[PDB]
Design an enzyme around this catalytic site. Structure first.
Site, PDB file in Angstrom:
ATOM      1  N   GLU A 217       0.824  -1.207   0.000  1.00  7.57           N
ATOM      2  CA  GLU A 217       0.000   0.000   0.000  1.00  7.57           C
ATOM      3  C   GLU A 217       0.862   1.262   0.000  1.00  7.57           C
ATOM      4  O   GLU A 217       0.514   2.254  -0.641  1.00  7.57           O
ATOM      5  CB  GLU A 217      -0.962   0.013   1.196  1.00  7.57           C
ATOM      6  CG  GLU A 217      -2.044  -1.070   1.154  1.00  7.57           C
ATOM      7  CD  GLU A 217      -2.773  -1.135  -0.186  1.00  7.57           C
ATOM      8  OE1 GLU A 217      -3.006  -0.079  -0.806  1.00  7.57           O
ATOM      9  OE2 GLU A 217      -3.132  -2.247  -0.622  1.00  7.57           O
TER      10      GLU A 217
ATOM     11  N   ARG B 170      23.780   1.695   3.671  1.00  8.95           N
ATOM     12  CA  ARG B 170      24.731   0.612   3.877  1.00  8.95           C
ATOM     13  C   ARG B 170      25.948   0.786   2.961  1.00  8.95           C
ATOM     14  O   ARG B 170      26.418  -0.170   2.352  1.00  8.95           O
ATOM     15  CB  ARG B 170      24.026  -0.730   3.616  1.00  8.95           C
ATOM     16  CG  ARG B 170      22.856  -1.018   4.597  1.00  8.95           C
ATOM     17  CD  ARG B 170      22.185  -2.371   4.353  1.00  8.95           C
ATOM     18  NE  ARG B 170      21.312  -2.365   3.180  1.00  8.95           N
ATOM     19  CZ  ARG B 170      20.051  -1.929   3.168  1.00  8.95           C
ATOM     20  NH1 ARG B 170      19.493  -1.457   4.275  1.00  8.95           N
ATOM     21  NH2 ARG B 170      19.345  -1.966   2.042  1.00  8.95           N
TER      22      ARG B 170
ATOM     23  N   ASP C 105      22.402  -2.027  -1.827  1.00  6.82           N
ATOM     24  CA  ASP C 105      23.571  -1.624  -1.051  1.00  6.82           C
ATOM     25  C   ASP C 105      24.285  -0.468  -1.763  1.00  6.82           C
ATOM     26  O   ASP C 105      24.448  -0.489  -2.982  1.00  6.82           O
ATOM     27  CB  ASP C 105      24.495  -2.840  -0.911  1.00  6.82           C
ATOM     28  CG  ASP C 105      25.650  -2.603   0.044  1.00  6.82           C
ATOM     29  OD1 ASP C 105      26.565  -1.825  -0.294  1.00  6.82           O
ATOM     30  OD2 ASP C 105      25.633  -3.206   1.137  1.00  6.82           O
TER      31      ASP C 105
ATOM     32  N   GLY D 198      30.416 -29.961   2.116  1.00  8.50           N
ATOM     33  CA  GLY D 198      29.771 -30.404   0.893  1.00  8.50           C
ATOM     34  C   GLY D 198      30.636 -30.217  -0.344  1.00  8.50           C
ATOM     35  O   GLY D 198      31.646 -29.506  -0.312  1.00  8.50           O
TER      36      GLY D 198
ATOM     37  N   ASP E 192      40.257 -13.560  -7.709  1.00  8.74           N
ATOM     38  CA  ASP E 192      39.404 -14.053  -6.638  1.00  8.74           C
ATOM     39  C   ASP E 192      40.123 -14.920  -5.611  1.00  8.74           C
ATOM     40  O   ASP E 192      41.131 -15.560  -5.914  1.00  8.74           O
ATOM     41  CB  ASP E 192      38.227 -14.831  -7.246  1.00  8.74           C
ATOM     42  CG  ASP E 192      37.456 -14.012  -8.275  1.00  8.74           C
ATOM     43  OD1 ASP E 192      36.888 -12.960  -7.906  1.00  8.74           O
ATOM     44  OD2 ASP E 192      37.416 -14.415  -9.459  1.00  8.74           O
TER      45      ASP E 192
ATOM     46  N   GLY F 149      36.527 -25.303   1.284  1.00  7.48           N
ATOM     47  CA  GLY F 149      36.041 -25.849   2.538  1.00  7.48           C
ATOM     48  C   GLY F 149      36.261 -27.351   2.540  1.00  7.48           C
ATOM     49  O   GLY F 149      37.110 -27.847   1.803  1.00  7.48           O
TER      50      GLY F 149
ATOM     51  N   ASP G 131      49.805 -21.822 -21.170  1.00  6.57           N
ATOM     52  CA  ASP G 131      50.036 -20.990 -22.340  1.00  6.57           C
ATOM     53  C   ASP G 131      49.042 -21.442 -23.403  1.00  6.57           C
ATOM     54  O   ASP G 131      49.331 -22.326 -24.211  1.00  6.57           O
ATOM     55  CB  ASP G 131      51.481 -21.153 -22.835  1.00  6.57           C
ATOM     56  CG  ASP G 131      51.752 -20.397 -24.127  1.00  6.57           C
ATOM     57  OD1 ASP G 131      51.026 -19.422 -24.417  1.00  6.57           O
ATOM     58  OD2 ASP G 131      52.703 -20.771 -24.848  1.00  6.57           O
TER      59      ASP G 131
HETATM   60 CA   LIG Z   1      28.688 -26.124   0.595  1.00  8.00          CA
HETATM   61 CA   LIG Z   2      38.937 -14.815 -11.315  1.00  5.88          CA
HETATM   62 CA   LIG Z   3      27.667  -2.124   1.882  1.00  8.01          CA
HETATM   63 CA   LIG Z   4      35.363 -12.412  -9.656  1.00  2.28          CA
HETATM   64 CA   LIG Z   5      33.190 -27.769   0.118  1.00  2.66          CA
HETATM   65 CA   LIG Z   6      29.984  -3.703  -2.677  1.00  2.00          CA
HETATM   66 ZN   LIG Z   7      -2.560  -2.743  -4.763  1.00  2.00          ZN
END
Ligand SMILES: [Ca+2]
Ligand SMILES: [Ca+2]
Ligand SMILES: [Ca+2]
Ligand SMILES: [Ca+2]
Ligand SMILES: [Ca+2]
Ligand SMILES: [Ca+2]
Ligand SMILES: [Zn+2]
Ligand SMILES: [Ca+2]
Length: 455
Positions: A167, A242, A274, A343, A354, A359, A431
């Site tokens: 609303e 944020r 964000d 897992g 990165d 894990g 390469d």
């Molecule tokens: Ca996992």
């Molecule tokens: Ca990467």
């Molecule tokens: Ca943030």
């Molecule tokens: Ca990345």
């Molecule tokens: Ca894992």
């Molecule tokens: Ca960010």
């Molecule tokens: Zn509505």
């Protein structure tokens, strides 16, 4: 072709693609097309003082306005403390994403004024509001009687809370996705379900998402993907929100009830907005298989549900943490920190350097392009486990294989696997171009073998 691991990554990355195709016999609209559809009325608040923000005040009425009895709404009643608390949380969720502010207080010489109150006559409907271009702009009303008690106890996740958000959306100038006994069959576009917009009348099952089962109800408490785009188109994005490092999900630091998770049984349904910083989507508390995509405007399948989490357009989320299940983690062009947790997980860092954590379990690190990990900005597997984990390059080699040597001979496909005992640092140089120098580099914390590579 490629491995099954890559195929799964590619499949999920495109699973929720929108635009230029028919779905369920209806045209698929992109977020931008829906932003226009939701604001097709042309109604909105105006910045009278020209300060770059819509400054609105609101009052929880304590007495019926002049002419109230003529509305045919029955007995008037003021919002309870519970309703006020929830209403403020809904207003806040809108102010977080767009340049609109809401302050409780009487109308003052503000850009507009809003009012909230209850009525008892069912003939008035469950709830209703007026657009900012009407003579009753700012008003929203909610039904409460013995036969309809939904608005008496609004709470995160229930329809009472979504009704407030919905609303308020109308008071801001948003219309329903279509001109609605109608059903989803009457929808103008395919994505007209509450998996995309809280303004929709149709359930997410129409588009295939699974949030809950019969008997139980789960509704998004805050603006979803398309709602955010629609309201930002009208008033501009609020980049102040944020703007520092933020964590969503488990161990949340977003300070919003709909972004927080504290139990493995929690039902999350939200769209991330964000303003900046190094952010993380922590879904470590779940044991179900999840699929997390850090691509802006994409959807993720979280906590045993599908298409329940998304990232708003124009937002860059850096990190993601999986759960104890077998998850898929897809990063973006930025440098991401991806942790699969327990897992057997499949991780895709994408562009940029990165930091990957598989894990426990047998994890697979997929690479879809040479640019994913170059000597300049190379990825690093902080916990690679030879014999168990795998480095997948099949999307690049197309199962062509590699030629492991000690030194590049100038032939495309040459790969070098090195290791350092008193450093526990491994490395894979390749390469692909065949220029006598490595054009693909992947460093690891732990020894890597030729049999740990899939190509
Ligand atoms: Ca996992
Ligand atoms: Ca990467
Ligand atoms: Ca943030
Ligand atoms: Ca990345
Ligand atoms: Ca894992
Ligand atoms: Ca960010
Ligand atoms: Zn509505
Ligand atoms: Ca203003």
């Amino acid at each position: 072709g490629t491995s099954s691991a890559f195929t799964q990554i590619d499949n999920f990355s495109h699973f929720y693609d929108r635009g230029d195709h028919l779905v369920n016999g209806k045209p698929s609209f992109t977020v931008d097309q829906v932003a226009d559809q939701l604001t097709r009325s042309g109604a909105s608040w105006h910045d009278l003082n020209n300060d770059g923000v819509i400054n609105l005040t609101y009052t929880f009425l304590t007495a019926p306005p002049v002419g109230y009895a003529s509305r045919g709404l029955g007995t008037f009643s003021q919002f309870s403390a519970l309703q006020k608390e929830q209403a403020k949380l809904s207003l806040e969720s809108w102010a977080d994403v767009a340049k609109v502010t809401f302050t409780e207080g009487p109308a003052a010489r503000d850009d507009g004024h809003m009012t909230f109150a209850n009525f008892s006559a069912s003939n008035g409907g469950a709830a209703f509001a007026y657009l900012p271009n009407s003579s009753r702009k700012g008003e929203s009303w909610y039904l409460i009687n013995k036969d309809y008690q939904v608005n008496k106890t609004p709470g995160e996740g229930n329809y009472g809370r979504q009704t407030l958000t919905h609303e308020i959306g109308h008071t801001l100038g948003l219309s329903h996705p279509g001109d609605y006994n109608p059903t989803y069959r009457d929808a103008v576009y395919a994505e007209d379900t509450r998996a995309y917009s809280v303004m929709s009348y149709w359930s997410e099952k129409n588009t295939g998402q699974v949030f809950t089962k019969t008997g139980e109800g789960a509704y998004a408490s805050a603006p979803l993907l398309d709602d955010i785009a629609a309201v930002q188109k009208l008033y501009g994005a609020n980049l102040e929100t944020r703007a520092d490092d933020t964590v969503y999900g488990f161990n949340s630091t977003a300070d919003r009830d709909f972004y927080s998770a504290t139990s493995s049984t929690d039902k999350l349904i939200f769209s991330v907005w964000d303003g900046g910083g190094n952010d993380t989507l922590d879904f470590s508390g779940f044991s179900q298989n999840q699929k997390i995509n850090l691509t802006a405007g994409s959807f993720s399948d979280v906590g045993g549900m599908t298409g329940n989490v998304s990232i708003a357009q124009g937002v860059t989320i850096e990190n993601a943490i999986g759960g104890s299940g077998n998850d898929l983690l897809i990063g973006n062009d930025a440098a991401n920190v991806l942790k699969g947790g327990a897992g057997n997980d499949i991780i895709y860092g994408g562009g940029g350097a990165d930091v990957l954590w598989g894990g426990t379990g047998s994890d697979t690190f997929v690479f879809g392009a040479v640019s994913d990990s170059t000597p300049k900005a190379a990825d690093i597997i902080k916990d690679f486990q030879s014999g168990f984990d795998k480095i997948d390059l099949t999307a690049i080699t197309k199962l062509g294989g590699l030629n492991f040597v000690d030194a590049f001979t100038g032939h495309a496909g040459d790969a070098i696997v090195s290791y350092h005992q008193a450093s526990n640092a491994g490395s894979l140089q390749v390469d692909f171009s065949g220029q006598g120098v490595a054009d693909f580099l992947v460093t690891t914390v732990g020894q890597v073998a030729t049999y740990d590579i899939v190509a």
